[PDB]
Design a protein around this nucleic acid. Structure first.
Ligand SMILES: [K+]
Ligand SMILES: [K+]
Ligand SMILES: [K+]
Ligand SMILES: [K+]
Ligand SMILES: [K+]
Ligand SMILES: [Mg+2]
Ligand SMILES: [Mg+2]
Ligand SMILES: [Mg+2]
Ligand SMILES: [Mg+2]
Ligand SMILES: [Mg+2]
Ligand SMILES: [Mg+2]
Ligand SMILES: [Mg+2]
Ligand SMILES: [Mg+2]
Ligand SMILES: [Mg+2]
Ligand SMILES: [Mg+2]
Ligand SMILES: [Mg+2]
Ligand SMILES: [Mg+2]
Ligand SMILES: [Mg+2]
Ligand SMILES: [Mg+2]
Ligand SMILES: [Mg+2]
Ligand SMILES: [Mg+2]
Ligand SMILES: [Mg+2]
Ligand SMILES: [Mg+2]
Ligand SMILES: [Mg+2]
Ligand SMILES: [Mg+2]
Ligand SMILES: [Mg+2]
Ligand SMILES: [Mg+2]
Ligand SMILES: [Mg+2]
Ligand SMILES: [Mg+2]
Ligand SMILES: [Mg+2]
Ligand SMILES: [Mg+2]
Ligand SMILES: [Mg+2]
Ligand SMILES: [Mg+2]
Ligand SMILES: [Mg+2]
Ligand SMILES: [Mg+2]
Ligand SMILES: [Mg+2]
Ligand SMILES: [Mg+2]
Ligand SMILES: [Mg+2]
Ligand SMILES: [Mg+2]
Ligand SMILES: [Mg+2]
Ligand SMILES: [Mg+2]
Ligand SMILES: [Mg+2]
Ligand SMILES: [Mg+2]
Ligand SMILES: [Mg+2]
Ligand SMILES: [Mg+2]
Ligand SMILES: [Mg+2]
Ligand SMILES: [Mg+2]
Ligand SMILES: [Mg+2]
Ligand SMILES: [Mg+2]
Ligand SMILES: [Mg+2]
Ligand SMILES: [Mg+2]
Ligand SMILES: [Mg+2]
Ligand SMILES: [Mg+2]
Ligand SMILES: [Mg+2]
Ligand SMILES: [Mg+2]
Ligand SMILES: [Mg+2]
Ligand SMILES: [Mg+2]
Ligand SMILES: [Mg+2]
Ligand SMILES: [Mg+2]
Ligand SMILES: [Mg+2]
Ligand SMILES: [Mg+2]
Ligand SMILES: [Mg+2]
Ligand SMILES: [Mg+2]
Ligand SMILES: [Mg+2]
Ligand SMILES: [Mg+2]
Ligand SMILES: [Mg+2]
Ligand SMILES: [Mg+2]
Ligand SMILES: [Mg+2]
Ligand SMILES: [Mg+2]
Ligand SMILES: [Mg+2]
Ligand SMILES: [Mg+2]
Ligand SMILES: [Mg+2]
Ligand SMILES: [Mg+2]
Ligand SMILES: [Mg+2]
Ligand SMILES: [Mg+2]
Ligand SMILES: [Mg+2]
Ligand SMILES: [Mg+2]
Ligand SMILES: [Mg+2]
Ligand SMILES: [Mg+2]
Ligand SMILES: [Mg+2]
Ligand SMILES: [Mg+2]
Ligand SMILES: [Mg+2]
Ligand SMILES: [Mg+2]
Ligand SMILES: [Mg+2]
Ligand SMILES: [Mg+2]
Ligand SMILES: [Mg+2]
Ligand SMILES: [Mg+2]
Ligand SMILES: [Mg+2]
Ligand SMILES: [Mg+2]
Ligand SMILES: [Mg+2]
Ligand SMILES: [Mg+2]
Ligand SMILES: [Mg+2]
Ligand SMILES: [Mg+2]
Ligand SMILES: [Mg+2]
Ligand SMILES: [Mg+2]
Ligand SMILES: [Mg+2]
Ligand SMILES: [Mg+2]
Ligand SMILES: [Mg+2]
Ligand SMILES: [Mg+2]
Ligand SMILES: [Mg+2]
Ligand SMILES: [Mg+2]
Ligand SMILES: [Mg+2]
Ligand SMILES: [Mg+2]
Ligand SMILES: [Mg+2]
Ligand SMILES: [Mg+2]
Ligand SMILES: [Mg+2]
Ligand SMILES: [Mg+2]
Ligand SMILES: [Mg+2]
Ligand SMILES: [Mg+2]
Ligand SMILES: [Mg+2]
Ligand SMILES: [Mg+2]
Ligand SMILES: [Mg+2]
Ligand SMILES: [Mg+2]
Ligand SMILES: [Mg+2]
Ligand SMILES: [Mg+2]
Ligand SMILES: [Mg+2]
Ligand SMILES: [Mg+2]
Ligand SMILES: [Mg+2]
Ligand SMILES: [Mg+2]
Ligand SMILES: [Mg+2]
Ligand SMILES: [Mg+2]
Lengths: 45, 77, 102, 92, 60
RNA sequence: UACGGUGCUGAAGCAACAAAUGCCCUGCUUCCAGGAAAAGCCUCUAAGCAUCAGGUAACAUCAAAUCGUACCCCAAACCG
RNA sequence: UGAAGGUGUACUGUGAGGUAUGCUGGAGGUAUCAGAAGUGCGAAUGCUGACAUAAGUAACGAUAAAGCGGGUGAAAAGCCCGCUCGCCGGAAGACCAAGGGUUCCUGUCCAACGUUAAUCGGGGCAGGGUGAGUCGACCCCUAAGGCGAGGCCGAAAGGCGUAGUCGAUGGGAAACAGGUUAAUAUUCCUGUACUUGGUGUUACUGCGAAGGGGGGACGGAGAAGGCUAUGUUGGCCGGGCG
RNA sequence: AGGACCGAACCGACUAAUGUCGAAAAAUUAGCGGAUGACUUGUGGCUGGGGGUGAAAGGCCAAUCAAACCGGGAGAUAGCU
RNA sequence: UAAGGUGAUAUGAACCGUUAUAACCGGCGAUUUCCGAAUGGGGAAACCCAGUGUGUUUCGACACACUAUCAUUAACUGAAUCCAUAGGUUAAUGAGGCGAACCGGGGGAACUGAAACAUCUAAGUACCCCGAGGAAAAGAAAUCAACCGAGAUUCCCCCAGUAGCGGCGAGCGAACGGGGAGGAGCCCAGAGCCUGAAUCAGUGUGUGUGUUAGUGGAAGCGUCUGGAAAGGCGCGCGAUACAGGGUGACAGCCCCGUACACAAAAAUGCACAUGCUGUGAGCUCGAUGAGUAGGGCGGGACACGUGGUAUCCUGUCUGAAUAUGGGGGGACCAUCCUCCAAGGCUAAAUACUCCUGACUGACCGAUAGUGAACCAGUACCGUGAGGGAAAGGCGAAAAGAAC
């Protein structure tokens, strides 16, 4: 009966994507953490 | 930003102590203004965002002496 | 500085084939020689379609540790330890006790 | 005209049914090419290496089939195949 | 080979690169893909022999 | 006929009538709640330059690169 | 010439426990007296794993419905082909976008997966399959909005914003039938098209903007007229004489 | 002409039964209201936590709301079990 | 250095060598797709779209180079008004981002404790932000002491849970003085004779040398038991080497090693001779840091909560004297003692481990130890930030079971 997740690759990437994070101050800290934890998927792409 | 050109007076912080000593963080902004100073040497007006004490420094020394120091630090006028 | 090597008459010190002589086939990177007519293991080799397919038991010359063998002297007539020296310009090996040269 | 690099395009001649049917019955050749390799570059390569007359080159990119075994997944590499339609002077 | 290729002319050194590319590399790369080659070692040594020459034409 | 389909040949191929929520219609009538923008497209001249460069036709020739193209899509393949 | 661990037995101490030994195990163990502790668990709706219970019980996911024959194969209610029967048909049909991402198609294999069986499969394992000047994206244009040189403002981070530059859900060049593979087609092949560029010749010739003007360029409802997609009838055609 | 009328798509959710370890963490069946407008819907934007948004119920802000979620202060504190 | 190699899961294939241009390990080179500060413009990271100049070409075209913003910097142009300044082009030049703690600055909570709670505490802690460096900061007295004199900072131990502070509750809590670690001192607010002599900051350059490849590197047997000997058993035999690890059961002597002795063409990390673009000595006379010290108001820092409150920092409003002078000595004042602010630099002791080697554990031994002994920050969960598993051992050797 309709759900929270209604996927869209444009919105996904615009919202959470690498260029969306790397833009901001806190975004560049988000990546700096994932890199420190040593993850494969840094961001969705 | 609220920073005098001459003195480097910037907005320091501190408490706002009541009668009952209820501390509450506040700011102490300096008395900044825009003012046009007649530079006799170069025969033109110069705008500086100085504080009220700065004006008395410019009264004490020559505006040339202040614009010597302002140019030395790497500011603009 | 490999003491035991390719074309060398060795004798086995320890193992089921204790006191048996043979020439080395090929020493490996792991540190395990293979000597002719020594560690004969009856492998059940399967008749694989590609190439030859004998289909039966076969006595393979399995590997043995380098430390378990030793070079034969052919003078005193028993196992012997190896050294290294500089005869002329080059480096060469030699025997300990009856100190000659290979 | 662009020596050396022309040789670094054409990977292999593709073998299949669709590759066979297009040899005899439509005068073309299928072949695998380097991931870039423009339709000019492939034509120019065929015109030198195979040294035969070319009508036109059609091109498409095959995707990597995700293969798995034991435990770990494994995406195959992508690659570009080129349907090269030859002219009336042909052989291979 | 490197020592003998080091004593060669700059324009002459291209011909060997283009000879390594024209025949040899491409020919073996196709010939291997078609299934007309047991001798797969020739793919390797030629690829190194290219690199050798392409490094040796960086003298200035 | 591997019994799946391949090859061959192939007559007529009309009028009437009914008819959309399709199109003419980004039209016409009207009502007020008064109904994006900006390029391509046409046109006008500024700064310049005339034996040129440019513009208009007619023909010839060359080019049109790269990516997606399978399959599901009111669903057993998406969201639960 | 059998350690720890496991498992039994027979003694022994007031108790925590000790001692000796048959089986298993196949390599470590540790007297004594000291020293140090992650030092002893049945409970915390304790934590993790394994295994019970209800129990071979409920349920097997729409009340659209199956039946018989022949084939395949070890085996067929469920697979394949056949003849009936039934259900959807403004969908339970056929094409797109979004989103999935090989599920497509061929060969072979049923351990698991499928709420049963399985020769079948959106399951496993190999191989194959996605062809564009015209369709869509990219590209030229801009809306909402985003970013934003200088700039203004702000303890710092940063906020706003101009010139700009992005940003489609909108505007902007042109292809349709027909055929074909196991799987692609307005993309390949037969036929007939059109478009927008570049370069050369010939004959003419005032062209020229980041600038002006035109257009692009526009709501709701309503009404009628004219048409076609589409159907329907007759005619023509081939078959039929049940 | 109409926040007109009846009535499918579409939008909603009044009654009843069913279901309540469900087919389903809000549905099905039979009826039910709106259905040219204060309508509905796709795509893309903007608004962010004492903040948003709200034809106002303390409703809604990712199955969580009289102050979201994740991480940190942090082993908070517990005269209680 | 070297007789075997072509990394592993993992055999197979096809070839290179063998007293030495195989393989391997080093040093310095070349190569270094695309994204990413990303930097030609853009963008949904790993994509799209360009511009200007060079050489070539057979029309089709490629090829390599350069073009971000900003800061200091010169050059040339440049306005509203005459030169003007703003402003606009090019070359030179550095910055930009990332990484674990440590450190200096700018901001800065709350739970909690007080058996409630507002002062207070937690605490200038958590956190956020900026800026460094191998450490950083601090620093040569306008210091602190008691008529004795000490002589920059930093850290450790005391002094001392003392003196003080405090709803005088909770709590917080010094200094002087003494032991040590450690040592070090100078420039500018300028003139004479005289000048390269002390001093460092670079270049080449020397040995004592050490660092990234290394090489050598001692000495065991006969028996018995067992699948297998290092084991029991008997004589040995080396030790500047019985640290340690392997090998078919516990190895000083089978092998790796170990002490121990020697290693480097290059890249060097260094410390002394050291020619030297370049830098300034001895000594006269004279100067000795103003919108500053201090004060009024409001805050903060000092153990010190405005209190009788010294002292430092300041937002605001003010304002001295300037060596026949001024600060400090814990309200304040007078003689004595003390120092010279408002300008600067500065090594070591101290903090710290993302990281590359040794070496040790009354540390763990797969529910432990890192979340992670295993292809784990993986699978899987979540829109996202983020959360986050389970999963070790055949044997001595695959001899992994022909038929
Ligand atoms: K018609
Ligand atoms: K706390
Ligand atoms: K652009
Ligand atoms: K030795
Ligand atoms: K001064
Ligand atoms: Mg979900
Ligand atoms: Mg969005
Ligand atoms: Mg407080
Ligand atoms: Mg500046
Ligand atoms: Mg294509
Ligand atoms: Mg590939
Ligand atoms: Mg591949
Ligand atoms: Mg790959
Ligand atoms: Mg591959
Ligand atoms: Mg109309
Ligand atoms: Mg029209
Ligand atoms: Mg299709
Ligand atoms: Mg539909
Ligand atoms: Mg359908
Ligand atoms: Mg469904
Ligand atoms: Mg034990
Ligand atoms: Mg015991
Ligand atoms: Mg005991
Ligand atoms: Mg006792
Ligand atoms: Mg315990
Ligand atoms: Mg228990
Ligand atoms: Mg108990
Ligand atoms: Mg309970
Ligand atoms: Mg459990
Ligand atoms: Mg059970
Ligand atoms: Mg029952
Ligand atoms: Mg029953
Ligand atoms: Mg039942
Ligand atoms: Mg049921
Ligand atoms: Mg049923
Ligand atoms: Mg049947
Ligand atoms: Mg049935
Ligand atoms: Mg059935
Ligand atoms: Mg049937
Ligand atoms: Mg029906
Ligand atoms: Mg698959
Ligand atoms: Mg299928
Ligand atoms: Mg299949
Ligand atoms: Mg079966
Ligand atoms: Mg089954
Ligand atoms: Mg199920
Ligand atoms: Mg399948
Ligand atoms: Mg074509
Ligand atoms: Mg379109
Ligand atoms: Mg786009
Ligand atoms: Mg706007
Ligand atoms: Mg700016
Ligand atoms: Mg600029
Ligand atoms: Mg600037
Ligand atoms: Mg533009
Ligand atoms: Mg645009
Ligand atoms: Mg669109
Ligand atoms: Mg888009
Ligand atoms: Mg689009
Ligand atoms: Mg048209
Ligand atoms: Mg199809
Ligand atoms: Mg065509
Ligand atoms: Mg209208
Ligand atoms: Mg109208
Ligand atoms: Mg009829
Ligand atoms: Mg008829
Ligand atoms: Mg008839
Ligand atoms: Mg007839
Ligand atoms: Mg109505
Ligand atoms: Mg009704
Ligand atoms: Mg509602
Ligand atoms: Mg029931
Ligand atoms: Mg009804
Ligand atoms: Mg209704
Ligand atoms: Mg009604
Ligand atoms: Mg009504
Ligand atoms: Mg929306
Ligand atoms: Mg936003
Ligand atoms: Mg509302
Ligand atoms: Mg209420
Ligand atoms: Mg509620
Ligand atoms: Mg709250
Ligand atoms: Mg709450
Ligand atoms: Mg707790
Ligand atoms: Mg509490
Ligand atoms: Mg380079
Ligand atoms: Mg770029
Ligand atoms: Mg950029
Ligand atoms: Mg470049
Ligand atoms: Mg600039
Ligand atoms: Mg400038
Ligand atoms: Mg930096
Ligand atoms: Mg930074
Ligand atoms: Mg502060
Ligand atoms: Mg409090
Ligand atoms: Mg409180
Ligand atoms: Mg309490
Ligand atoms: Mg405090
Ligand atoms: Mg140090
Ligand atoms: Mg404190
Ligand atoms: Mg050695
Ligand atoms: Mg013995
Ligand atoms: Mg012995
Ligand atoms: Mg054993
Ligand atoms: Mg040396
Ligand atoms: Mg040297
Ligand atoms: Mg002074
Ligand atoms: Mg003062
Ligand atoms: Mg005072
Ligand atoms: Mg205080
Ligand atoms: Mg005083
Ligand atoms: Mg003072
Ligand atoms: Mg006093
Ligand atoms: Mg001083
Ligand atoms: Mg230092
Ligand atoms: Mg130091
Ligand atoms: Mg110990
Ligand atoms: Mg574990
Ligand atoms: Mg376990
Ligand atoms: Mg265990
Ligand atoms: Mg083992």
């Amino acid at each position: 009966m309709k759900r929270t997740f209604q996927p869209s690759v444009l919105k996904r990437n615009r919202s959470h994507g690498f260029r969306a994070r790397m833009a901001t101050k806190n975004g560049r800290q988000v990546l700096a953490r994932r890199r420190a934890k040593g993850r494969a998927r840094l961001t969705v792409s | 930003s609220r920073v005098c050109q001459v003195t480097g007076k910037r907005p320091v912080t501190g408490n706002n102590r009541s009668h009952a000593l209820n501390a509450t963080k506040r700011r102490f902004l300096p008395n900044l203004h825009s003012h046009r100073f007649w530079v006799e040497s170069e025969k033109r007006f110069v705008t500086l965002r100085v504080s009220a004490k700065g004006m008395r420094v410019i009264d004490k020394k020559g505006i040339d002496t202040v614009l010597a120091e302002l140019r030395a630090r790497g500011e603009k006028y | 500085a490999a003491k035991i090597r390719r074309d060398d008459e060795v004798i086995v010190l320890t193992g089921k084939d204790k006191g048996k002589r043979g020439k080395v086939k090929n020493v490996l990177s792991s540190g395990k020689v293979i000597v002719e007519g020594i560690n004969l293991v009856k492998k059940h080799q399967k008749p694989v379609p590609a190439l030859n397919q004998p289909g039966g038991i076969v006595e393979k010359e399995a590997a043995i540790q380098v430390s378990n063998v030793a070079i034969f002297n052919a003078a005193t007539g028993k196992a012997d330890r190896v050294g290294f020296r500089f005869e002329d310009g080059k480096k060469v090996r030699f025997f300990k006790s009856n100190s000659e040269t290979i | 005209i662009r020596e050396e690099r022309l040789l670094k395009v054409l990977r292999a001649p593709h073998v299949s049914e669709k590759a066979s049917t297009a040899m005899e019955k439509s005068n073309t050749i299928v072949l695998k090419v380097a991931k870039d390799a423009t339709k000019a570059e492939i034509k120019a390569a065929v015109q030198k290496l195979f040294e035969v007359e070319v009508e036109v080159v059609n091109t498409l990119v095959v995707k990597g089939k995700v293969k798995r075994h034991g435990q770990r997944i494994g995406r195959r590499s992508d690659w570009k195949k080129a349907y090269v339609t030859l002219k009336e002077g042909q052989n291979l | 080979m490197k020592a003998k290729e080091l004593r060669e002319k700059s324009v002459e050194e291209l011909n060997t690169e283009l000879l390594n590319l024209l025949r040899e590399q491409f020919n073996l790369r196709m010939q291997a893909a078609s299934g007309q080659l047991q001798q797969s070692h020739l793919l390797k040594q030629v690829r190194r022999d290219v690199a050798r020459v392409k490094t040796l034409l960086n003298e200035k």
